[PDB]
Design an enzyme around this catalytic site. Structure first.
Site, short mmCIF file in Angstrom:
data_model
loop_
_atom_site.label_atom_id
_atom_site.label_comp_id
_atom_site.label_asym_id
_atom_site.label_seq_id
_atom_site.Cartn_x
_atom_site.Cartn_y
_atom_site.Cartn_z
N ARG A 169 -11.11 -17.17 -36.33
CA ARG A 169 -10.69 -17.69 -35.02
C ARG A 169 -11.08 -19.15 -34.97
NH1 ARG A 169 -13.96 -17.52 -30.02
NH2 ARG A 169 -12.62 -17.70 -28.20
N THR A 204 -16.79 -10.48 -27.45
CA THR A 204 -17.80 -11.30 -26.73
C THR A 204 -19.11 -10.54 -26.61
OG1 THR A 204 -16.07 -12.53 -25.74
CG2 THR A 204 -18.24 -12.69 -24.67
#
Ligand SMILES: O=P(O)(O)OC[C@H]1O[C@](O)(COP(=O)(O)O)[C@@H](O)[C@@H]1O
Ligand SMILES: O=P(O)(O)OC[C@H]1O[C@](O)(COP(=O)(O)O)[C@@H](O)[C@@H]1O
Ligand SMILES: [K+]
Ligand SMILES: [K+]
Ligand SMILES: [K+]
Ligand SMILES: [Mg+2]
Lengths: 501, 501, 501, 501
Positions: D54, D306
């Site tokens: 990412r 997350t």
């Protein structure tokens, strides 16, 4: 709504005011304890949904523990609500010694070769690490070449490459970069150091707690049923037979002997902190789900512990992984969730309890959809348990606001709780020890009332107590169970469905 | 072993002795009924498991019917056991007329062209078949070209190819080889001949039965709720409100309107004889399983009827297909199985009831393994039903010898029966009409007792009556439900698990 | 739409024309067999859904059986459709003897005391019933006081009260009123008369049938694996290894040894007529469901037999209990249903086959909703079975008009059939013996084609054969399995989903 | 074993070496990027099980992003393994303004009344906080009384208690003690600030990524299907139609519109960081389980994101709650788990990926026992999907080491993955874009191979490639699917079971 999942909150200086000073502030430890101010803070934790306080005898001498227990007894009066008292034993801890000098710690780097001493009551140096072993045991002949000595929450690994018979010293290789600080936890996984079934220091701690007035003992590092039964004999012989024993499962021996430990104990504390050092950390979630199922199937209490809202020790908001962990512990079937440093030592004790209560109350609303526990699989092994199954059936068939049981020992309440009904459980009991003793069972709201006569209507009493408690109102449907009549019944034998006036 | 599946046995001359003669012997009809000898034969059918007797008003006049009903009342006194009384209506029957001359029948071959006369009050010839239509209705404008006229249990088919407006005759083609005999049943499927909701003959028959004393009416050829509601109005207006109505489903309109018929009736009789002429014969097993499920879901009574042990009319052993049929009706979930000519007209009425009882008893032992009904799927739609579900739960959780309900109207016993508990059900009721009216509910043993007062221990009464009836012994576990206390409870609200002393 | 449940029809004189006379007409046996006329009648039973004809060697000599088998071969050419040939053995039958001097039968009443002789080759008197025991065995030492001798399909009970050593006669008491006629079946339940594992009469009938060309043997009164293995040894010796053996289960010993019998056999015939005399009649439905489940789980063929449409022997319509019995045999999971007297001896052989086919075709559409068999529970014991499970999965996932298998031995078709897919199974095989050997497997349509070469497109062959058989049309989805490629594949290893052009 | 759950690792300076300095050493940012040394660290993350990197365009300009993508292309050569490239958009953003007189922050106390300005291009004062809103939009008309302004990861709450139309300022009460620092993230939950469907900054960042070469875009704060479709139009217009779009669901509007967003997207990233600020934190576990189930039912990819191993940013070991979180994300059914700061900016990037891989691999072994996803429930909506179901069936029937699909666009591999077979899935594809595009599907091992010719044996090729990849050995059973013949088949139409030599 009522919070069915129970909270164990560990107490420490975080809630305690010392001459107007908060924990952290300069001179704090120089001041006298403000007992009323500390009791008022503890009161708010009770109001936010703490159901039991944990007194961790790993930290703080008898005087500190006894003063904190007294402060909670005032907080109960301030909050208007009773809580359980849980003593957590030190048990067979190994810690790094004090170093020579005013050296508090040393940093190490991978591959660096050092030694760890087995001789007791000596200080560490940078090159020879000494251990404070519980009861000053000599561990030299119990740890083999290839065993691992893990220091501080398993952060630094030391590989036993060789053994020096001359000094009784382990020659070790530093496996990863990290620090050895003083008075840190040491784990030596997959060893059977011959710690006694009950060490004198734990014997002493337990007898002290029993004198102060406790409801639960959590026994650290339970390996076998014998470790539970030695504690049970203390409770019985001192006139404290009412006290309930939670075996802490935190090493491979406890996992291997789980069935005999469950049979000996009143419940299990899933001590994930040590467990995730003693066994592969990725196996902890497997063991958690299996333990919760087996303890619920035995009609006993399971507490999920350690790191549940870890970040709220230092920060005002929990991580997403902490919220997921609390939520999933409930869905797994836990009776109770626990806070350690978050409530005892952190910056946000009240917010930690409140946050855990919010998550726990939301997760209970999804147990119908997602809950792992399956009461349909159980063998009903007694007529009280048959009635508990019928109660669960009634709460599935219709909207039941509350189950009431008139329970002398809490046995009926424990069996109803086992079945996880779609309702709160008001346990009407006749002594304070049985009342507090129920405070960690899923869903159970214990309430003291007078023992009913053979002339009292136990069903009218159930309704009136439920109304007085604010639990029901006119037109709510309740399920009531009792042994009828008083003096003839040998057990809970009746179920009534009643509409509140 | 108590037989949970109930037996309806049609009575007729087979059990009746007339001036020392059994049915079959010449001049039989010329002798008068021997009431005592006949009551002794019927008492043997009651002892063998007949729970209700069917009086079929399609055959035999008010004298034959009334004397038979009196003879049963004596039989009950001889057996020391009460039974249900069921009147089965004639309904909108069509039969072939008598033939001119003294011809009893003619034989026909595929393709022959004959006529069917719709004119009432004439005799048949070989070429012009006359119909005796219930109430002398003219059916000419009610049967279209392409409909079929079936004679004698659907054995001979006549296709309507044309209509003669001048003579009001159907021109028909013989569809297959067979016989037209006098006074044989005629069916004309998928027609809506406007028979009245309640014909005067059925009115007069029902009023006669209501005067004699009946518990059930089976209404032939029910098409809509109105066919049931018209009979309900007579029962109500004659002060016979307790009488229960079974709609007989035996044509396509009955199948189409089944939901509204089940709503208006107390139960359904699956009248497979006509049904399997009026609808494709291979659909009857599909409708049977569907009707049983639906009637059970509604908490009502289903009777499976016709040909169940047909061969036992003429032979002392049933075929493998007959035993299979009875067994599978029980597995499907029937409350009751029925005998028609086997118990009414055949050579072996007693052996027919015995054989049926033996099969029903064996099949009930396989309901846990193979049973089609599923109580787990039901919506519990009232507090009495919630209690019924909890009773079922208790009988699944442990070995319960008996369920006892104290029931004013039978409502609690019907809801317990709906759930098919693994136990017999003792229904303690306080009048004979309620008692007899429970005799076709699965598993229910009705028993008359004194209405308990507010001072009586209903749980001790329950045990005492169960012990008296020989249904339980010392050590057995029973479930008892009641509305406690008398005068305060508005419904069954209490369940007790009790060990018999 | 295709009939998945297979029909076995018993052949006899009912379909056979003699010098223009039908069975039952005067001087019928006077006239010679009209082979062409009889073969046209049998072709109509083929067209109505008969999949195999049974030749019952209990009745008629070799010349009659051989001529009947020749008549069926002509009937196959007239129909354009092949059928299976099944020989049913006489086995260990006991029949009542001829009575002294032209006489036919006598009647007896409860409690009456008569004798049954064991000496062979003598006539009965009213007082002394003689037996025709298969192979003229002496049974006197093999029948205990306390046994029952049952005459004519179990209708009359004779209790053995004593034994006369002088005459080797059973002293018996009549248990119930009824008739002893000449040449009727006798059963003596729960005995082990030492009939040989293979009698000479059965050896001689089997070798005869094998010389004529049969596909199946149904072995009467199988007690052990040995009764099956003796016939297997004849088939092996004579080069008839392809012949399939169906054990007839019709006594307690067969039921007790069912597992080892299923292992030894290719299938089971549930011989309910004798079974329901030899075991309690009310147990036959329990054993029927259990046998069907066990035979299907073994990947073998089950036939349900006897009294399925019994009334149609004498009447043109079956009873409601007969239709229910055929429907429920399908739901239970039978591969095949059988007709005995209905097709062999009755007045309505064609109507009996048509009626059974209509019921079987309606029942197959309710297998998804009501079917007892549970293919999800099977262990998949080979890679062909894993492919059979995957085929079933594809027919559950989408609408599959047909499953096609290219099968050398029929193994893949048998495994696909075991799983009861939601589709017809076209089995493309390469020799007539394999073709005929698949004719009693549920859902299988066998079809002869050339063995595919390494160059052929087997998926194009499958589609072409399916289109030419009229089983599929443009746009239908089919599943085809085969061993791809020919010469390299060692089993069926491929599944293709294909849309018909 | 092979890791079926995929890892998304965020890249950043943690793995990057600059003139020999590690991130956080003095003068790090003064040294230039060492590309080789950085690529070696990245290659170790690939080897440890990162499946996709990412590139978070919230932090770092185009030059930094492009250089980082080039470093990953070198890392692939070092590892001999390819990874997916995912671009994460900046998206709509609100941040606290700079304070007047270059002040950094102010402290605030629970109960204080301050103001929030909506006027743009203005500095904050302690008393009047100003906001930098993306596109300098005027927020005033979007925020009603009772909404919150949450500053710095939701740490500080401001309740809007009144609005002043003359200053366009919010009157807010401080909900808790905390800091308002300059340039910190601000959330205003449950508002519809009219941010454009696609802002120009995001349009330009996406065009830059597409020109560099990416496989995935994660779209921040997706509110409706239009936010996805505007990005899809850019992929389509630039000739990058192969690029897959993940909607980030992180506010109430995205949850309310989930069904239409799943329909428009290729998958969902469960952006728990923002979501747990924007919705009640205790609802995130509920939404996580629901989104995983819905995305899997749609045949699309779900990433759980997350704080999964948050403590590993600073410490070498994860907490018990973090391991639980990762494990339970797998059990819930996630395709992929994600690391943010743990891999991008922490002290232990390689340890974080290794730990996540260890947990994900253990959890996948418990999917049979505990997995939430239920493939039996799916409608099979196409013939490829029917074949995927059959594949699952084969892996449930027997021990299948590997499923191989020969897939041109990955469609078959996506459908097999959807069904979560008990096997790894080797996806043999013929271009690098399809290969990389499969890297986040559960269980899929993509492998570039030569397109098969009309004469190639695709089943031999499947076995060869599986052995080349080291995924099978001699005697393993594999399931292989393909469109046969190559190029002429409209879709995957064939399944083979093959034994590896
Ligand atoms: O039904 P069980 O499990 O045998 O338990 C019966 C025991 O329960 C008790 O009723 C205690 O129950 P409560 O404490 O709930 O009243 C004892 O009096 C009795 O011996
Ligand atoms: O609980 P439900 O289904 O509403 O039934 C309540 C009705 O049942 C009755 O109790 C009758 O019940 P019993 O006839 O079994 O005693 C009525 O008194 C009452 O109105
Ligand atoms: K401790
Ligand atoms: K035979
Ligand atoms: K971003
Ligand atoms: Mg037989």
């Amino acid at each position: 709504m009522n919070k069915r999942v129970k909270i164990v909150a560990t107490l420490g200086p975080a809630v305690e005011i010392r001459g107007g000073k908060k924990f952290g502030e300069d001179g704090y430890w120089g001041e006298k304890l403000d007992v009323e101010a500390s009791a008022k803070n503890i009161a708010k934790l009770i109001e936010a949904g703490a159901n039991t306080f944990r007194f961790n005898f790993s930290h703080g001498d008898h005087q500190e523990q006894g003063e904190r227990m007294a402060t909670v007894k005032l907080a109960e009066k301030i909050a208007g609500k009773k809580v359980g008292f849980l003593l957590d034993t030190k048990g067979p801890e190994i810690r790094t010694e004090l170093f020579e000098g005013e050296a508090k710690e040393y940093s190490y780097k991978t591959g660096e070769k050092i030694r760890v001493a087995t001789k007791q009551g000596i200080k560490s140096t940078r090159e020879v690490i000494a251990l404070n072993v519980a009861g000053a045991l000599d561990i030299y002949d119990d740890v083999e070449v290839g065993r691992q000595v893990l220091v501080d929450d398993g952060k630094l690994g030391l590989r036993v490459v060789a053994k020096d018979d001359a000094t009784r010293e382990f020659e070790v290789e530093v496996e990863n970069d990290g620090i050895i600080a003083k008075q840190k936890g040491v784990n030596i996984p997959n060893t059977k150091i011959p710690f006694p079934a009950l060490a004198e220091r734990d014997n002493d701690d337990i007898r002290f707690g029993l004198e102060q007035g406790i409801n639960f003992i959590a026994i650290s590092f339970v390996r076998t049923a014998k470790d539970v039964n030695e504690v049970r004999a203390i409770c019985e012989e001192t006139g404290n037979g009412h006290v309930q024993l939670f075996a802490k499962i935190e090493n491979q021996q406890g996992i291997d002997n789980l069935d005999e430990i469950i049979e000996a104990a009143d419940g299990i504390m899933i001590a994930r902190g040590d467990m995730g050092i003693e066994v592969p950390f990725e196996m902890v979630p497997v063991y958690q789900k299996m333990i919760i199922k087996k303890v619920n199937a035995a009609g006993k209490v399971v507490i999920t512990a350690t790191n549940m809202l870890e970040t709220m020790t230092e920060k005002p908001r929990a991580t997403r992984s902490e919220v997921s962990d609390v939520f999933n512990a409930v869905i797994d079937g836990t009776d109770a969730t626990m806070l350690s440093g978050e409530s005892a030592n952190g910056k946000y004790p009240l917010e930690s309890v409140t946050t855990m209560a919010t998550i726990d109350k939301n997760a209970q609303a999804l147990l119908n959809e997602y809950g792992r526990l399956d009461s349909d699989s159980f063998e009903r092994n007694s007529k009280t348990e048959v009635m508990a199954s019928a109660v669960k059936d009634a709460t599935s068939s219709m909207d039941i606001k509350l189950v009431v049981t008139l329970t002398k020992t809490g046995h009926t309440a424990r069996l109803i709780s086992k079945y996880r009904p779609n309702a709160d459980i008001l346990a009407l009991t006749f002594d304070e020890l049985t009342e507090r003793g129920l405070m960690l069972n899923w869903g159970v709201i214990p309430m003291l009332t007078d023992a009913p006569s053979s002339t009292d209507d136990m069903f009218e009493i159930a309704e009136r107590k439920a109304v007085e408690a604010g639990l029901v109102e006119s037109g709510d449907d309740i399920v009531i169970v009792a042994g009828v009549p008083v003096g003839e019944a040998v057990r809970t034998n009746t179920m009534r469905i009643r509409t509140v006036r």
